Amino acid sequence: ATEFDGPYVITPISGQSTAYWICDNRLKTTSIEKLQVNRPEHCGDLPETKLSSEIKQIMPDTYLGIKKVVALSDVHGQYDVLLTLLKKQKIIDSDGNWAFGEGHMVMTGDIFDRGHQVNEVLWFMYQLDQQARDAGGMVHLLMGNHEQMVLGGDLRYVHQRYDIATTLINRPYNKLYSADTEIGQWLRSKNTIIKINDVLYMHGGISSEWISRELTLDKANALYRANVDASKKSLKADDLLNFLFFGNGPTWYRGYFSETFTEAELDTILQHFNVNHIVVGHTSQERVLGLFHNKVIAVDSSIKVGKSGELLLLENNRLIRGLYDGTRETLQENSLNQ
Ligand SMILES: [Zn+2]
Ligand SMILES: [Zn+2]
């Protein structure tokens, strides 16, 4: 079985973009006209996208007064599962397009790796970003540890199938998502940690080291954008970058899932950010669930396994689990845990 994969789009600072397509284990290269990334013939059902003049703008990391939010994470290249979940939960319409109005979606990282439909997910999320903006809503795609790994050249977890693209396009996988690329430029605009209303969102979690380093959302998000292309040596040698990018930092920390982590300790973090909840991915669960009297909501629902997933809905002072079958279960209402 040969592959179909792409497109990989190069976007220079002036002038037309170029798209690279893997079609039946051969490369096709097209010149993009009028921002429309159109697939050549004989190329499967690979995604077609209109390039955006707006969604690569860097957006705020803090938001007030947002009526409805949905959160999910760790798709890990499972496009079919993502699409089914969003369809069943009525986040998208019958054409596959944003249907969430002025709502906000927070996807807390880890589109890349393990799965076989990475570019399908990426281009879908790019289109959804634009569509949400056009509706007056937003998609917040946050950087996870696998975004950071891929962009930085840690390729341990890339599906073997992508060796076709790296051979045919003749560059390593990190350079298929470099700053010269449309997707790479889009990703390099993204935040890592955000606050919406009384909720903090990030991929892994916030450890007490954040507090001792006197970090802020803006300072961290800016350093993440500026240094995702730093060498490992440089990241490791800078004390602060080392914190941010590695095991105890926002995109790797798993302390909220440790059997010794205490709710008291969580309370000090909640207080530090003046939030009531922290929503995290990274550490895979069987379902969207709450921990510590629903002060932490885990939204890695194991989409990576390729069978099902779930989301979290925050609306009307409720926390709601949205199941893969389209049903809903309340986790918390007003402040009362269910
Ligand atoms: Zn993950
Ligand atoms: Zn992760």
UniProtKB/TrEMBL annotation:
Taxonomy of origin reads: Bacteria, Pseudomonadati, Pseudomonadota, Gammaproteobacteria, Alteromonadales
Write the protein's name. Answer: Protein-tyrosine-phosphatase
Which residues does the record give as Zn(2+) 2 binding sites?
76, 110
Amino acids binding Ca(2+) 1: 74, 76, 110
The UniProt keywords, alphabetically, are: Calcium, Hydrolase, Metal-binding, Zinc
Coiled-coil annotation reads none
Question: Which residues are recorded as binding Ca(2+) 2?
Answer: 74, 110, 145, 203, 282
For the keyword DNA repair, the answer is no
Q: Which gene encodes it?
A: PPI
Q: What is its EC number?
A: 3.1.3.48
Tagged with keyword Amino-acid biosynthesis: no
For Zn(2+) 1, which residues are the binding ones? 74, 110, 145, 203, 282
Q: List S-S links within the chain.
A: 23-43
